[model samples]
Target: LFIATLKGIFTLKDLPEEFRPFVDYKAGLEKKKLSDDDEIAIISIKGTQSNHVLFLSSYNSVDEIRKELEEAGAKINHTTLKILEGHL
Candidate 1:
């Protein structure tokens, strides 16, 4: 169960057509704008299990991101991204 909150934000529109739910230009946080010209980062999330991967910018600030993920038992992964399985 991947959950997102805000001490920060993350976005997914720019991610390429290879991805969705995360890359949908129309999908957004707090139903806000979807572009590079955003304020807080977009904490792009999949779910308890995607049945997905975590594509984040980290805004060059990785420490905080790692902290948040660590706090949630998640880690920055480059392979074998998760899928929303069982889906809670």
Candidate 2:
């Protein structure tokens, strides 16, 4: 199981077909994005005796990923994006 701060709720399948590429692209971009900054903390959390893996990332990074997804054809809007941020 993968647990996050209610932010990464959208599974890849939840995204539009055309935007799937962006999701993949963002995965790669995430590594690149982090390489540029040292202040960002990249940590992995494992629940005690539980089968869960949690990844801690930045809200700004998520926004950048979303932007890339939208650019790649995801049906995302400002309101939706705002709601996404609120989850963080």
Candidate 3:
């Protein structure tokens, strides 16, 4: 699996606030069947400030969603990538 973690400490807000836009984007993507297998996990965490974070995972939707978030003007702090071994 392709795993990507990104956080926006100052640029993001509560789940519904920042998350709605992302959901809207996917509505369009759903018609194209492009993001059918993608998943994004969110959490509320504490840092120097209150932060909302997302851990996005997919077979290959990493760059697609990341670009959408960046284009929507998210000033992401640290975007880390990892390769999760795939097995049953």
Best by lDDT: 1
All candidates: CA RMSD (Å): 11.3, 14.5, 12.9
lDDT of 2 by residue, 1-66 (tens): 543321233233333233543243454665744233222112222424322222234435567765
Once superposed on the true structure, which residue ranges of model 3 sit more than 4 Å away at CA? 1-19, 22-34, 50-52, 58-88
Q: Between which residue pairs do clashes occur in model 3? A: none
| Model 2 misplacement above 4 A | 1-20, 32-80
- CA error at residue 36 for candidate 1, angstroms: 1.8
lDDT of 1 at 7: 30
Model 3 deviation from native, Cα RMSD in Å: 12.9
**Backbone clash pairs in model 3 (N, Cα, C under 3 Å; residues 3+ apart or in different chains), count:** 0
TM-score of each: 0.30, 0.21, 0.25
Tens-place lDDT per residue, model 1, 1-88, is 4355323333444444234444354445457667664322333345453423233433455786557544434345534333223121
Pick the TM-score winner.
1
lDDT of 3 by residue, 1-88 (tens): 4224344332222223445445435435557333334444443333444444343443355786557446323344544422223210
Which 10 residues in a row give candidate 3 its minimum summed lDDT?
Answer: 79-88
